[PDB]
Amino acid sequence: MVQTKEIALEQLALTLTGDASWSSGPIYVVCDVGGTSARVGFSQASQHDRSGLHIIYVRFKVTKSDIRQLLEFFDEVLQHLKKNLPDHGASFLRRVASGAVSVPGPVTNGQLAGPFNNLKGIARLVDYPVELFPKGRSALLNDLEAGAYGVLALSNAGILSDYFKVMWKGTQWDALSEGKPAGSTIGRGRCMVVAPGTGVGSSLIHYVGVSDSYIVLALECGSLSMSWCANEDSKYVQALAGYMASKGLDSTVAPIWEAASNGAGLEFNYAYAKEGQKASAPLKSAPEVAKLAKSGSDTAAIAAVDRLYKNLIGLTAETTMQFLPLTCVLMGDNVVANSFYFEKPENVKRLQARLHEHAMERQFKFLSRTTFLRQVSSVNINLLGCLGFGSQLS
Template identity: 25%
Template sequence: MISDKLSPMKSWKVGDKISFCLGADVGGSGIRFCVTNFHDPRQKIEPGHMKTKNVHEFYKVISDFSKAIQSVAPGAECLGSSFACAGLRKGNTVQVMNWSGSAEDQTIKIPEIDRTLFPPNHSVMMNDLEAGAYGIVSLSEMKESDQYFTKLWGPKSGSIISDKGHTIVLAMGSGLGAALVHHDIWTNTTVVIPTETGFLLSSPRGIDHPTYKEDVGNINYVSDHYYQGKNAPCFEDLASGRGLVIDYDYLIGRPSGWTAIQIVEQAKKGDAKAKLAMKKHYIYFLRAAKQIAYGMNCKSVVMALSNQVANKWLIDEIHKSLEHEFKDTTAWKATQGISVFSQTKDINVNMIGTNYMAHFAARNKV
């Protein structure tokens, strides 16, 4: 029972008060909570996945969870809260596209979240990759990032969260997400800025480049598919789950009808074109990474989240090709000073990030 899982909170009392922080990772199928001791973030309780498929269930789950906490630890107070939400943020609303029902059924109205677990002026609502980037910041500060991330190439002194410049965290899933970790050298502070740089327009090689013909052919095929050949595709059109499907279709010369998952499965079984499509969509991933990193003065690039871990078998195989792509640029001197990291072991960096920001929100008015 949930009350049994929450019972350790009783030992968090300082004086006559129990103070805690709350992190929450909200996805298409439900919520995962993490309750941490305000006085010692290492003391945490994760009660498990709670199903929600629309906003009405979302509000109820939060209200019920608040009641469960009070039944175990009467008077316990949430001092800071942070939610990561895989959805579209507009003002004081977030639309979770993967929830069922109408747009209204999918839309969280932030002021309507139970204030006992989302206290005013001490709560933060983030998108999922923003939270993930803060999770990586937290792991770096705790010196635990090496357990989950591997440096693929770059200067020996380069760290996962650079203190000499900024860091870009990238994730390929159904789309191509990017979050900038901005490091202010004057105040020595770190702030994550969500970006939409996955929508930067792609560009082919120069006409004399050895891969020009296949490169421009792939890009034009994607342009024809989405934009009737009138506009260049963005990097997300090429480097993402849907990008993988179109990259594969280009290689076989027709729509396959396969999903990205099916292409990955065939690649693992030895299908040469499926494997080449996976390689090509990673090539475009690195092409986007170098443009974003150079343009934003980043000294570190982090390829993160579960898809990156799942594709480790491929990354290990095409490592040299990816490094060559990253450094094949007019700004090649600048790329020599950029470290590139890949996540190799699963951990919920989103949850770590929400815990990190919940404690920040508890200590500061936001």
């Protein structure tokens, strides 16, 4: 499985010297930024068909609310290794196969992470310690790009089924699976990744036959306009649009798919199902609605959740058609937390029903080719993705 230990910076060399696994094999430098917290550390695999992935990280605090503070952190790690390893961390650093930083903001060509709304400064990959971020073997990653690499990492480790469950198997799985069971691997094909939460993240693991390797593309599929529709479905999109305007934003402008599939949307859904076409005020927060839905009481909370995932799947009907993926993965803390919804066969059936409303499934059965998976176990997917990135390097 995935073993993750957070350690004090002072305990780093102690931890590295304490477990001989660290003494051999490639080392993948991992780092993720989120909130006031920059976790910086190291990852490696171990050769099995149950690979076992290990991560060790130090949690640093962004005390200046400034992304350039990563430089201080990398130097503290580096100076600690030279000061607390017998060979100045020579034998360790020579095995660094890659370095990656997952950041919660826009990223340019994996080389520059642009303005953040709540942090100062620009992340520039070139400014980073070459010993932690080897030339030509390093990148800044979008949060969802890193997450997708994490999925791949889990897959290559043979451990996908411990963290993900099959929602439904696509018609094209067996033909492409090389004899492997659905959910055992993402397999040799595209994997479309969507992650609902505050916003709705997306990314694509693209499989490359020529080199038998994968590359992840960061995406903004949550920001695709909702699809046209009529009647009751259209009344909802209309209400969502007007709500989102309440920026030359009209109620005549389509709202983005994210708005119907995130926390904000869940809160809107609750109002909409109770009265809604009335007080735009949601009152109940997304946590509450979901808890109320899990309980089974509040009929409106249940409908609001149902509409939430019906529309999340509606977004996936679009992504499934555009990318024709072997697999589509629904992930993130919210998907794990709302496992109760997907544990009901009737619900899964109705979700697959929704996917199948797309014109291209109706006419040509394109979308049903895709195997859908759901995250069930929490994990530091973004840290793992820093390994996933490194593992795909030519």
